[PDB]
Design a protein around this ligand. Sequence first.
Ligand SMILES: Nc1ncnc2c1ncn2[C@@H]1O[C@H](COP(=O)(O)O)[C@@H](O)[C@H]1O[C@H]1O[C@H](COP(=O)(O)O)[C@@H](O)[C@H]1O
Length: 509
Amino acid sequence: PEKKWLGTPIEEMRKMPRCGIHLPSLRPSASHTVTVRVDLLRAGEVPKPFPTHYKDLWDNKHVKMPCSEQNLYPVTAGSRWELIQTALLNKFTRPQNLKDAILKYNVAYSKKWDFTALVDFWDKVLEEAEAQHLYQSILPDMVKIALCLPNICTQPIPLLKQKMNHSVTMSQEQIASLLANAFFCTFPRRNAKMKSEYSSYPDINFNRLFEGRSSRKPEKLKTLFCYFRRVTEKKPTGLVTFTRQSLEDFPEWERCEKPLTRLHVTYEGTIEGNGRGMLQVDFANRFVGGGVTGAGLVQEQIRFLINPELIVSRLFTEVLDHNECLIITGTEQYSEYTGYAETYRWARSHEDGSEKDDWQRRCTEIVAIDALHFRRYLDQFVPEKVRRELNKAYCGFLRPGVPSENLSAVATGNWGCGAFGGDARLKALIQILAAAAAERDVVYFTFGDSELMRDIYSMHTFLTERKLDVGKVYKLLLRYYNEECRNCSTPGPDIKLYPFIYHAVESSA
Ligand SMILES: Nc1ncnc2c1ncn2[C@@H]1O[C@H](COP(=O)(O)O)[C@@H](O)[C@H]1O[C@H]1O[C@H](COP(=O)(O)O)[C@@H](O)[C@H]1O
């Protein structure tokens, strides 16, 4: 019978906090927005905002806050925030009470936003006692933190636009307020389908969480209400950093002399569970988070639901271009789940026991890197497409300025494979080569595919023992393309990639 894991023992891999650099004092800079009082930051205490009082910016460089005086609405043009306050400061006892509240300042979507999933969750899924707790405690507590936004999020939040290399660090507390606003659908200019300014950003308002008849919706609702109950009952004290990274220059893949690094590969375990303290890959949509409140419930959405603080990146993160990624450090896990996609179920609250770094960020680092979709299988072997995926992965893994010995292993798996069209064996090798270029080790989860585990180890062991560096491996991929793919008249070649690599090397001088 197969072994459960192969390669370097997972305990020998680097992880946070042990491997981390000594952090300089947290401070704002031209590259780093920081929305809390760094001099007052103390372990276990709720961070205080900077500035002390609300400052507004309503422009094309910053989040358009619902509490802005420039957020206007017909009442003559009146304050939309005053309308939001009035709508939400009402008793809810029936689901239509919450619908009608949200629609008071979203009149234009009265027909377009269905609330069937909210109604059925409230009336059918929840027992009487749980519904009562929802409407007597949770929802009013959520309203309270939502309407505290201007006192909590005092500093304008910059948009992380394409090409920016920039970080925003905010408190978990600040994020809870923003997410409660998202729940009540309060963010202006983020709703219309013919929207202009924000067409290149993901959705942020949670309206689609309430729509349709999917058996998925109640599970998303339980998962998010789990979060909201936690943060309203006990205010979180940590910080979270969101970093957009965009590289213009990449390895010379055909000539790269860096050796392959260590591999641990296994068909059991999870990225979020067994890759604790490691760089955890989110198989992202380029609109980070993808359909987190929509239909989608695969690897990304699941992660955005169990660590809901990730969802706030949608407020300010422009769609990723080919050479970009989003790095999020410090999100907390609030829920546990069982299953996946159509079998996903909220299981219970999670009490996150992760250590915090010196900026009071949980030692949990997640990187969103979007694979390409391959609607024609052979497209992915074309060198341009190999390079694209190498470069995307490389960008997700590289930490400029940071010594390699201070980098954790990368915890990843079958990125963009399955119904997205990626080839698992090609994608494994791509991420192994990108990790090698970034001088990181790899922890690879094959999620039940033991033969794939075996094949990836065998290949990695062969290339390692035969001392082929990144460039030599890359050159073999170009050989496979040129000799077996370029003129292939079938959907896939007769000779597969790993068999080709073995034969090529075994045939060589
Ligand atoms: N994220 C931040 N951005 C900008 N300044 C900050 C931040 N965090 C702390 N400071 C400031 O850096 C200083 C610490 O610098 P040292 O550690 O080197 O000494 C802090 O005192 C903070 O000062 C400002 O906040 C205060 C607001 O006061 P009221 O508006 O309520 O009157 C005011 O003093 C103002 O100057």
